[PDB]
Amino acid sequence: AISIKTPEDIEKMRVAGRLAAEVLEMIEPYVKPGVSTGELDRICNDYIVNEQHAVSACLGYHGYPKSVCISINEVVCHGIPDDAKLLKDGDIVNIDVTVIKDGFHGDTSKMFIVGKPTIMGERLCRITQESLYLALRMVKPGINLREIGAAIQKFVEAEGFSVVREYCGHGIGRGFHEEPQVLHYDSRETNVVLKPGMTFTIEPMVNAGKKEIRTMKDGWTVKTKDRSLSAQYEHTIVVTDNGCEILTLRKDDTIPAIISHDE
Ligand SMILES: COC(=O)[C@@H](CC(C)C)NC(=O)[C@H](C)NC(=O)[C@@H](O)[C@H](N)c1ccc(C(C)C)cc1
Ligand SMILES: [Co+2]
Ligand SMILES: [Co+2]
Ligand code: NA
């Protein structure tokens, strides 16, 4: 019973998606060795509230205490900004942003590499983004979400990496999380034929080591069980009549905003 957005709803999601992307573009010059993740989160929240006139969807959500999630190295997701935690040379860092504007959500994340990359960190981030991009190139009416999940997993595993099972992409709109689930791996349970006007995220988490994860005792932070590096990228999109439109595109993305499968 999946939600179909109107043209007017989609325009509001273009606005909210642009805002979420713009948080990531804004924060970039601050993501440097020696900065604290607590400071990055304050910069983001101040920007969202005071400049964008929007709200963070994460703040207070199930009690989450901060405005963005900042996940470093072996942290898979839900890293909590902390004034004591300083970024350092070689770190891979996900910043995941969700804003609400005019009732609609925009949800996106990217990796930043701090200082001189490690070769493995760079490779892991690259393959993770590539897995998102290959999925985006498949989105069009009539395709099944199952085909997309299977393709992400095939691609990632061929690189000797693994796909986290637990924290899938999602429908999004007036609600933060809506149907459907967007799995990043193959499942016989998945049977969702895309229709124009569906809006959802794709947000693969890819581990350099094994797929298993662990939640820390703080009740939020998720790490790889084997302490291998983990990376994630996320975009919010709308299914169009012949493809998709990426609502959270940034200037540094290297895929077109509008992907068309028509002749
Ligand atoms: C089983 O846990 C989950 O799947 C939950 C955790 C919440 C609902 C408690 N959902 C997620 O992690 C989803 C898949 N994450 C997402 O949709 C992320 O793109 C989104 N930017 C986000 C990040 C953090 C949180 C929590 C920590 C406040 C919520 C939402
Ligand atoms: Co997100
Ligand atoms: Co999301
Ligand atoms: Na990580």
UniProtKB/Swiss-Prot annotation:
Designated name of the protein: Methionine aminopeptidase
Cofactor note: Binds 2 divalent metal cations per subunit. Has a high-affinity and a low affinity metal-binding site. The true nature of the physiological cofactor is under debate. The enzyme is active with cobalt, zinc, manganese or divalent iron ions. Most likely, methionine aminopeptidases function as mononuclear Fe(2+)-metalloproteases under physiological conditions, and the catalytically relevant metal-binding site has been assigned to the histidine-containing high-affinity site. Binds 1 sodium ion per subunit. The sodium ion has a structural role.
Family, as annotated: Belongs to the peptidase M24A family. Methionine aminopeptidase type 1 subfamily.
Single GO BP term: proteolysis
Residues engaged in binding a divalent metal cation 2: 107, 170, 203, 234
Effect caused by changing residue 96 to A/E/N: Reduces activity 50- to 580-fold depending on the metal ion bound. Binds only one equivalent of the divalent metal cation with affinities identical to the wild-type enzyme
Gene: map
Function: Removes the N-terminal methionine from nascent proteins. The N-terminal methionine is often cleaved when the second residue in the primary sequence is small and uncharged (Met-Ala-, Cys, Gly, Pro, Ser, Thr, or Val). Requires deformylation of the N(alpha)-formylated initiator methionine before it can be hydrolyzed.
PANTHER family: METHIONINE AMINOPEPTIDASE (PTHR43330:SF27)
Binding site for substrate: 78, 98, 177
Gene Ontology molecular function, alphabetical: ferrous iron binding; initiator methionyl aminopeptidase activity; metalloaminopeptidase activity
Reaction it catalyzes: Release of N-terminal amino acids, preferentially methionine, from peptides and arylamides
Domain of life: Bacteria
